[PDB]
């Protein structure tokens, strides 16, 4: 992307229904810090995700790497509060060559002290005037009445701490729905009535594939038993139902 959204109003581009070539992420070295929670930082290619989220924004000054599950601060708590159960991770790399302006990109608002705090994952573009002293203020600024945005301040020679680490949060949810987006695998021919190691749209195990007589509904992709273990899958290429 040419330009990303600011940290208070960060964009959210949902990706679904395609093949995700994670190789371009795994083998790349331009990513300064790939310190990756939730899943392995290297072998992203061997999972299928229910839904993938991409919150991309820019943070510098303090809190350059304070975006982590179980972290607090001015940037990580009052502008974008990454949840403490966060499954996914953060790609960050300095963008001095391009995103940092020749003078200063004074265009990344970061809204220090909104009211009290933020719960996980709500984008709040609300500009209400903050009040801490004299309450008479009503959408008007006064003695103790603030307009809270107060944008970032970056320069090409800011320094490593004040250097913009372009954050791209791949926030994965692995147990939300049938998987729709994942890795670039060869895809082999289907084999029945034999002991095989299978990977059905991210569901992995070893077993024998047989013909099912279950009446799956058109939107429903797989089943589970009383034991809450997988016992049926719809083939992702031909809409045939198999018992596993």
């Amino acid at each position, epitope marked *: 992307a040419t330009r990303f959204a600011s940290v208070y109003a960060w964009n959210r581009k949902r990706i679904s229904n395609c093949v995700a070539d994670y190789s371009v992420l*795994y083998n*790349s070295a*331009s990513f300064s810090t790939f310190k990756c929670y939730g899943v392995s930082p290297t072998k992203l290619n061997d999972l299928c995700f229910t839904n993938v989220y991409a919150d991309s924004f820019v943070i510098r000054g303090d809190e350059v790497r304070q975006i982590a599950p179980g972290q607090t601060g001015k940037i990580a708590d009052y502008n974008y509060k990454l949840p403490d159960d966060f499954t996914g991770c953060v790609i960050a790399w300095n963008s001095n060559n391009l995103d940092s302006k020749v003078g200063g990109n004074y265009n990344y608002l970061y809204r220090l002290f909104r009211k009290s705090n933020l719960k996980p994952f709500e984008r709040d573009i609300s500009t209400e005037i903050y009040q801490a002293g004299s309450t008479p203020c009503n959408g008007v600024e006064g003695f103790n009445c603030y307009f809270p945005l107060q944008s970032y301040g970056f320069q090409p020679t800011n320094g490593v701490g004040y250097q913009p680490y372009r954050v791209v949060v791949l926030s994965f949810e692995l147990l939300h729905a049938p998987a729709t987006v994942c890795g670039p695998k060869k895809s082999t021919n289907l084999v029945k009535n034999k002991c095989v190691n299978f990977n059905f749209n991210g569901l992995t195990g070893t077993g024998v594939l047989t013909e099912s007589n279950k009446k799956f509904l058109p939107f429903q992709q797989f089943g589970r038993d009383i034991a809450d273990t997988t016992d049926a899958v719809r083939d992702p290429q031909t809409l045939e139902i198999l018992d596993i």
Partner: nanobody
Framework: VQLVESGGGLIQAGGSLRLSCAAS????????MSWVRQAPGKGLEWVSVIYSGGTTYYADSVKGRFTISRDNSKNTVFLQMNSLRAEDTAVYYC?????????????????????????WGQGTLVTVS
């Protein structure tokens, strides 16, 4: 990054030389070390290249004469010139190929192929006369 070169000089036809190219700030190992000659008012026509180890890659018109080696101790590429001919008269540049993470381009991960050229030195005029 700076690259200093030496060895070129006025010699009669059929002589011998030794081209020396010393690199400060990087070595002969980091990136591909190529050799190009840029004839006066023509393109920079690639001559040869010594890779990070073990190459005898030459141009079609100069096969079997040029010999390429390195002293890694002093970080110097030597290009020993024997059996001159007419077309070798040019300014010779020891070219630094675009190293791994070329200008921190955000797509190429450890693919050292990257067949372009990074910054080089100022070049030595090598004339056959």
């Amino acid at each position: 990054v700076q690259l200093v070169e030496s060895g070129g000089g006025l010699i009669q036809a059929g002589g011998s030389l030794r081209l020396s190219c010393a690199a400060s700030g990087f070595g002969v190992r980091n990136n591909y070390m190529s050799w190009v000659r840029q004839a006066p008012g023509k393109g920079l026509e690639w001559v040869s290249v010594i890779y990070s180890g073990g190459t005898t890659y030459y141009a079609d018109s100069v096969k079997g004469r040029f010999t390429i080696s390195r002293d890694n101790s002093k970080n110097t590429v030597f290009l020993q010139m024997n059996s001159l001919r007419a077309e070798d008269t040019a300014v010779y540049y020891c070219a630094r190929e675009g190293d791994v993470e070329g200008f921190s381009d955000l797509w190429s991960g450890y693919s050292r192929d990257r067949y372009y050229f990074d910054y080089w030195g100022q070049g030595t005029l090598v004339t056959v006369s």
